[PDB]
Amino acid sequence: STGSATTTPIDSLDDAYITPVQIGTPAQTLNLDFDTGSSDLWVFSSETTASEVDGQTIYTPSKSTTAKLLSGATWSISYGDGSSSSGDVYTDTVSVGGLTVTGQAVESAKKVSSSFTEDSTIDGLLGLAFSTLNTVSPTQQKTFFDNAKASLDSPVFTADLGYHAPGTYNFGFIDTTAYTGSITYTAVSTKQGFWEWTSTGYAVGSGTFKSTSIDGIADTGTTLLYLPATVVSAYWAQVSGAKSSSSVGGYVFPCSATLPSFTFGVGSARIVIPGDYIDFGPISTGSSSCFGGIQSSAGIGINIFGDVALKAAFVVFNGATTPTLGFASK
């Protein structure tokens, strides 16, 4: 089997991407944030505290003839940005782009943090990291990909995120028309539960490539590119007026700037992030100070190749017995 679904930016800045997912019988379609940095499929639901729902589409398990309460199971997750959610668990039929899993754990939110409530466009998350990170207790549950894998034509999914445009998540096949050149594959460590890999270095604009190992994660659920302070300082030093602002919470730059590109290494290959991908717009409405899309990972404890990096590539998440990651230009 295979599946193919379009993923759409939630706003004009590509702050996140949503992908329609069918849950239950008859189908209830929710727009979920596909997140290769976590491993829970959770949804706003009829059980979510009413005051914490503001415009989201909810899953109502009582209206699904295939929903079953997973007795005694609860979940609770806290993300790196400080957001969180928790609740109980159903199993139900879940389909993405024509690919169907029966018996998928659908984690129904009883509580969500303010940041989720305040964003009407995201109806929940669909985790695509390794199932070892799944928070369901007392019986850990598998991700949608893990459940689908054996049925797939090939045990892979691909992320093809657009810049200020829709893109595609494919399951079970590699669309050879979706990228240019060849796909370069690189080793993955699953020890922390992430798609963790080592970049071979970077360049700023038309500058020389610096060969240096940068361990980090391929994370579709993080907006920005978080890298060591040395790297980030080297990038922003090429932008007149750019500075790190403790009050804003990162590097800012004059909105009048033309940003340089940023290149990262994948083995001997190179992925170029155009400068425009690094502009996240005014820090507040009407401001001429703009927020940068490359930020320091210092104090996160991990480097994160988020959407800013991933959207410059066609990315293969290869879930073979020994997982790997593939990157191609596009």
Side-chain angles (χ1 to χ4, degrees), residues 1-62 64-67 69-109 112-141 143-148 150-190 192-242 244-330:
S1 64
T2 62
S4 182
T6 297
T7 192
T8 300
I10 64 165
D11 65 19
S12 65
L13 300 175
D14 299 348
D15 280 316
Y17 299 77
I18 49 173
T19 308
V21 177
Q22 283 70 51
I23 310 173
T25 308
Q28 301 178 39
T29 300
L30 274 66
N31 296 329
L32 306 187
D33 184 351
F34 280 26
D35 179 13
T36 63
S38 71
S39 305
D40 287 51
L41 193 175
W42 74 261
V43 296
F44 277 79
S45 76
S46 57
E47 302 180 325
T48 308
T49 299
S51 62
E52 297 181 350
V53 185
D54 187 7
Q56 298 79 11
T57 296
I58 64 168
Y59 170 57
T60 304
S62 67
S64 175
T65 58
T66 43
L69 178 69
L70 186 62
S71 184
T74 58
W75 62 281
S76 179
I77 192 161
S78 307
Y79 299 102
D81 73 324
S83 65
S84 62
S85 53
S86 60
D88 54 21
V89 187
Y90 292 80
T91 56
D92 209 338
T93 302
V94 174
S95 300
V96 175
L99 170 65
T100 300
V101 168
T102 56
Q104 174 67 43
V106 176
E107 301 173 34
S108 167
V112 304
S113 63
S114 304
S115 56
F116 286 114
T117 299
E118 289 160 5
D119 176 18
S120 65
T121 71
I122 289 171
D123 300 324
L125 267 63
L126 189 149
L128 293 166
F130 293 87
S131 294
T132 54
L133 294 180
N134 176 266
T135 78
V136 178
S137 177
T139 307
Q140 186 171 65
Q141 301 294 302
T143 69
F144 175 82
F145 179 53
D146 209 336
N147 281 324
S151 302
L152 296 177
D153 290 358
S154 181
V156 305
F157 67 92
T158 66
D160 179 10
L161 303 179
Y163 165 69
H164 292 0
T168 307
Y169 280 103
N170 291 329
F171 291 84
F173 72 106
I174 288 163
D175 181 355
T176 61
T177 72
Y179 58 86
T180 63
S182 58
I183 305 176
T184 295
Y185 290 86
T186 198
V188 164
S189 171
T190 64
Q192 291 192 85
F194 300 122
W195 292 92
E196 189 173 1
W197 65 290
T198 301
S199 173
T200 48
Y202 70 98
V204 177
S206 62
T208 62
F209 186 85
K210 174 73 167 183
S211 296
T212 184
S213 295
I214 306 170
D215 295 343
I217 66 168
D219 185 2
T220 60
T222 291
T223 311
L224 308 185
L225 174 51
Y226 294 88
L227 291 175
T230 47
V231 181
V232 176
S233 181
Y235 179 80
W236 290 108
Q238 298 302 311
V239 180
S240 295
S244 181
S245 172
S246 52
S247 59
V248 175
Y251 279 89
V252 297
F253 68 94
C255 292
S256 64
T258 302
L259 298 177
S261 61
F262 185 89
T263 300
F264 65 93
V266 182
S268 58
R270 305 289 179 255
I271 300 295
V272 181
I273 305 168
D276 287 355
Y277 292 26
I278 299 161
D279 185 346
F280 278 74
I283 61 172
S284 291
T285 303
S287 181
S288 71
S289 178
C290 273
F291 198 67
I294 296 178
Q295 296 293 347
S296 178
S297 64
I300 295 178
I302 199 155
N303 300 305
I304 307 172
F305 294 89
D307 299 333
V308 163
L310 303 182
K311 78 177 76 169
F314 178 87
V315 188
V316 180
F317 294 80
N318 170 27
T321 303
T322 300
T324 64
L325 276 170
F327 292 82
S329 294
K330 67 187 183 191

